[PDB]
Amino acid sequence: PGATLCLGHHAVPNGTIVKTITNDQIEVTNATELVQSSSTGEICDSPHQILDGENCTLIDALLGDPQCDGFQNKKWDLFVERSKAYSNCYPYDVPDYASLRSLVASSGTLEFNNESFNWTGVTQNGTSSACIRRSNNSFFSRLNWLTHLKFKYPALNVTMPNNEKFDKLYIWGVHHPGTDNDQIFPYAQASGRITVSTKRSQQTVIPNIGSRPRVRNIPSRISIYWTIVKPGDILLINSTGNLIAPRGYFKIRSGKSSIMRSDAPIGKCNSECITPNGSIPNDKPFQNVNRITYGACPRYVKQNTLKLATGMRNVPE
Amino acid sequence: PGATLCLGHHAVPNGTIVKTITNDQIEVTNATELVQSSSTGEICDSPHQILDGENCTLIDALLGDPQCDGFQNKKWDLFVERSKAYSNCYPYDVPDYASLRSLVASSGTLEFNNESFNWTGVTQNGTSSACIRRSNNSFFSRLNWLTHLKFKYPALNVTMPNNEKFDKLYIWGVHHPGTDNDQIFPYAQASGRITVSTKRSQQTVIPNIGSRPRVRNIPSRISIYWTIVKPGDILLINSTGNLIAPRGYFKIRSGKSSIMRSDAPIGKCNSECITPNGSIPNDKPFQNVNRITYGACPRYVKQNTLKLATGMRNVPE
């Protein structure tokens, strides 16, 4: 009689469909998902240092809007700005807002050193009813609103050398008065000019008197500018009026820091990859949750699923 | 005697050469072209809405140069600018011309709503011999040149709220006079200032008196600026002279719209993919006609031919 010997391979009742070079649908015994498509909905507070901005933008914390006093000198790997955030101080704008936000976010610190500028012949610490701190008229904590002393505002010519190892970042401003009275009361004269210079830079700014639509009852505006001063170099502030002066400088670092707009809650959990929708696992090489990512993350792709076969072709009985 | 049974495969007298991983020239029985390399030379008017600019740039149609009166309130999927186009109104420039062009092209509409601005105490509807409409001195249809009333130009402080669902786009300008006389005749005084503000923005502009090389006999210039006003927000125009005011706003939409420079004629035909050289078929995955494309188009590659084998290796008798 003899014998029969059959060579063969396994199969499964429940196959999965994958794509190939020659066929968009072929059934294999097993496959695994290469596109991550879900989050828990939380931003994990580990292992990256997360700073929840809450009611504050990065810029409001920078300037020192009173509701952001808690942020002073904080660091972050990732700063999270909330859409409910709002300003509650003197109305202001920033030419190149986006660049200032970006370079501060990237630096990853709000570390501030105070400096003693020689402001002889003016009155310091000007305040407003638009910027309430601890139930009292106040101003931005990092800024110094200079007004007249005995109805005179003489020409300012103040200097500050950078003898440090690092770049200093100086934040400063110009008061654009709403009316004639908003120029006369603080500076008791017609016009200001501000020239902030270094060995390698100069910015000059004219106040423009004129009514703007009221924001927190105020038709004036502050315009915010910035200046970086290298080691060896010197800051020079030249002003005949309308200067919103710095009280010192911010350290500017390089590192891995950034900022992300997100309304997702912060959770007590550990995940390497953050998106605005929440953290995501990073086992898979691709993800379709968000093009915006921070950390060790899968790369963003348009596809919502990509199956990699991990078994032979399924050919059931 | 028995029999002979030979297994075999076909061949053809006329093979084609393809590239492989191991060989830059191998003959296969058949192949197909993957790079589209030709157009008919026409831009098909279907299925995309094509607006032929003819003698007008997008910006000239926007401002309302008299030869572009036919474009009022038109929409487009694709706006085609011709190289023969030329301006025929008051000479002007646009700081960030490219961005204004781009954002209007992308919005895809010239829909304009008139608004009644309170211009009390000035003369409206200033015209010039440089901008002829229907054989009469005229001006840009969307702009309102304000001059003196009874040799006085008082300070303007005009407001306009955005209570709509959409962003409003306001287009406005500053007259830079060529000489002293070009400032005295229209405004009967020395200098203007314009401050266009919102709750979130402010632009301020000084006229600079000075001769420019004549264009259509005119040594003055108009400089054009723009302002977007969000829902809830308010436009404020503050002027002591030289204001080229808006007559209302443009709707700004989002969608698939764009603009393309091309001298190709528009044809009565249906093609999904447009290039400046004309429309092209989109069966193939790649094309070498033009890096500039609009619609469902093959991707641009540097190669002029790529043959995909659709048959076995050719081994003739």
Added chain:
Amino acid sequence: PGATLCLGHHAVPNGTIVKTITNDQIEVTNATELVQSSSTGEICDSPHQILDGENCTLIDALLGDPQCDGFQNKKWDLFVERSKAYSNCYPYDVPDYASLRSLVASSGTLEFNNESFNWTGVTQNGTSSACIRRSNNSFFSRLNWLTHLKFKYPALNVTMPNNEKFDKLYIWGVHHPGTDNDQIFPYAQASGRITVSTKRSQQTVIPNIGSRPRVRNIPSRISIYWTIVKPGDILLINSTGNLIAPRGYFKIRSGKSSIMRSDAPIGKCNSECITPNGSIPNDKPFQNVNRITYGACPRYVKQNTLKLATGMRNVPE
């Protein structure tokens, strides 16, 4: 008895490890390196035309700082700026320094044609102790510092048509005085204004009087601007003071030219591909020497080695 016939393949005592799709380490008989990872450390002077800037930036050679007099009218495929370079003339800045550098570097020539501008009623050839040429007070060779004639500086209104085939590039400036005396001595009056215009362009610039930190004992600054004039078009310079005028124009070309920061020495050798670290061979398709390259170069990748197998799997005795 008969015979035994064994089919087989070679092997080697010393195999190399390569990566595959299924295995990160498999031994093959032979392989070759696809990533170039070394330079000799020299920039080869052939076959590209290399201009060693030595002590001069491109901009200093452009303006005509006295230590750069040797660069007049030179061309280059690649301009090499050294980190030891320094300026030694009147202190200056350039708004959009990077763009001017880039467009000059890309043009690849410093060819300069002198023009005779009608400067009647002012004194030409103003000099300074900050800009020493041949032991005498001098200035930038391409610039013309205009001052008062008989304590009067009348309004300038000078014109220059472009009747050539090419775009002309005009380089010019504004003197920002340090003090009142630095404005009175040269222009013997209060304020300047400069308006450089064409049929299609206008730039206008106000001097701002004010002290800057001293650089080569000078608290004033020059600010440098530029203007391109097309064929058919006309330059117009309008000035009431503070003009640092052009002595003519630069040709602006298109071609393969560029600029590279590097401290590598120039050698007598022939290599197609230049990096800041020195030239590199270009046999390999990839390199990890520098992301900055000029010429026919391998593409930059993050990997330091990639082995391509050029032999079968090694299976030793």
Added chain:
Amino acid sequence: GIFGAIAGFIENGWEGMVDGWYGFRHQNSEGIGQAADLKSTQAAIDQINGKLNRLIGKTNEKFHQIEKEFSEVEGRIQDLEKYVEDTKIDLWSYNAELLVALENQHTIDLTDSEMNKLFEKTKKQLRENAEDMGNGCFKIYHKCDNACIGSIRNGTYDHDVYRDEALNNRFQI
């Protein structure tokens, strides 16, 4: 190439086979014949249509983009615009070149594979009644008329019917 049949042990293709890609030629007592095999032919064709379905008519809609030509010298921002477009075009140009090279190598290989599978299938079917001559032909050691050949092509050939005849002929002296 990689299986060794097409341009390998099969010396050349047949120009006179115009109704299929693969097939059978025979000599017997009743003459010399040719017939195409439909299944092997369709298997190769389905795979090639597979590749075509992924490549033909699959294009991507793009609308407002950046500018890609310029009439003005502008410097930094224009350098970036040009560089982005040049970068993009080289990456796609690379994708297109690699794609076609790999697909073409695979098409050549899978067409060679179908030839080989047909050959092997026919060899097994013949059992001990035939020998492989090494050039893609079998010497069949029994009388095999047109019905018999037809039966080998349709997969209905019963080797037991002829086995006695065949072994007698094969192991003769």
Added chain:
Amino acid sequence: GIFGAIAGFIENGWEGMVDGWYGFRHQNSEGIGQAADLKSTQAAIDQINGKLNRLIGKTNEKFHQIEKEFSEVEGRIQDLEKYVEDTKIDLWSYNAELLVALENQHTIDLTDSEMNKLFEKTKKQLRENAEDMGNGCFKIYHKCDNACIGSIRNGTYDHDVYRDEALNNRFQI
């Protein structure tokens, strides 16, 4: 697919083989049996784990990047930002699609190859004692009890022991 065993000359897989990917079924005097082959199974599995090692848990750290959504209409620089991100995403989306298509085609092919190698190895081992029926089964022309079958599976089968018995049975009339 490209080797012709899985979904080819082997008509279907075996759902009742749950301890390996490849194996042996037999009928003899002592009954009908099944045993998985561990080496062929592990060879396929090691290669697939090979691909997984290159794809799973290999992600890239990125930190500060560009902005990718916008609340304001800004024109030129925003067009460039969007265009760069859109360009990037299409190139990676392409890489991901191609990658999975090629890997899947290769996985199907290498699993088919392991089947084929096991079959061929077993065929050589049997020498002249068996014939290939063409459906992945061998007719063995000698008495082959469970120890004998076991010996074919473990690679210890000595064909000389049974050769006389087998030739007598094969070349019978």
Added chain:
Amino acid sequence: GIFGAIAGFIENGWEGMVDGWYGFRHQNSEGIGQAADLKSTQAAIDQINGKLNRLIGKTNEKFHQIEKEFSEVEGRIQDLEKYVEDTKIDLWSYNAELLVALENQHTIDLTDSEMNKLFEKTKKQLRENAEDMGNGCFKIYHKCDNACIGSIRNGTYDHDVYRDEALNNRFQI
């Protein structure tokens, strides 16, 4: 790997074969010999030179580009410049990694294929005069001196000359 010869049924390579990549070892009455096969060796080498022609000396000219290092903190436009370069470099780094992985897998496979084709070609040539021992060696069942071996290597071996001798030896008891 995928054909099963190199690192498969051939137990190892031969270090003492230095004049070719593939070849023949024999034992007969006249001794034990080795000779390389030039055609199989050249076929593998031509394909590998094929890949090299596409990769070596094929570089792309680039001239004025964007800046890629910076001494100043500038924000938005510098972020975009850096991001574009970082994007580009990852895409090329990916292309280079994938390229080498696929080419290396293909080189290993095509070299294994040439081994297999040589083996199969030799098997067919021998007809019924030899048996496959399963380790890449054939037992030849007739007297086969150096001229006879030489004739198998040159493709001139006539199996009919020895067939009677061989069948007598093979089907002995």
